[PDB]
């Protein structure tokens, strides 16, 4: 899966 990061990455 994919998580929207606080820094704008998708992890």
């Amino acid at each position: 899966d994919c998580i929207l990061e606080r820094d704008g990455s998708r992890s």
Partner: antibody
Amino acid sequence: QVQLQQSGAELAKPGASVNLSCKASGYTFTNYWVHWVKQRPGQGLEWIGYINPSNTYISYNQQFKDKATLTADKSSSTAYMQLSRLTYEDSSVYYCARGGFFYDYDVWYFDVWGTGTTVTVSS
Amino acid sequence: DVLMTQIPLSLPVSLGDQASISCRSSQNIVHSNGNTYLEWYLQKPGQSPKLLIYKVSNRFSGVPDRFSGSGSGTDFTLKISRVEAEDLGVYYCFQGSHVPFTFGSGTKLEIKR
């Protein structure tokens, strides 16, 4: 019972490294970011970086990129920060803090703080 | 980096008066998801910081009505109405919108009596 437990103090020698632990309890460790913050005595707060404990994604302040190394152990619900090549300027209080449930963007903030570890660099 | 400039550095206030603290960002702090992550924290002596206000103007759970946050663009303000002895400590603004996240230099609130 949400808390982040840090050891009160670490004494480590100049030119060495030290590993700071931040033990999460009372919530799902893998659903929230853990951040680290430096506070020099008498002085302000400096953000070091954060880790996503579910997938180990790390975001660093470039100022600490060769000073701090963040890791997270899912089985023990513990986040770690290694400080390497210690100098007297690394002596400080370091906090870990819970800084956002991933899936609710309105609550990305530091709601739970660890009690802080006083790092003293000395021989 | 976003510089967060806090004014003043220390502020004496009489009990019952309003205190006002300013925080200016060197650039806009609207995150790419649309939120402005501007928080105010209070750190009392010997303690960790604690959240007072988030997303510029939202009071965190348990924080009294007399704390209010406002602002937009690059100018943000914390107002403390009817200051009480328990309000003592160092207030920090924080932006959580652009890495590296950054704190203001802090405003030490001091009480006259």
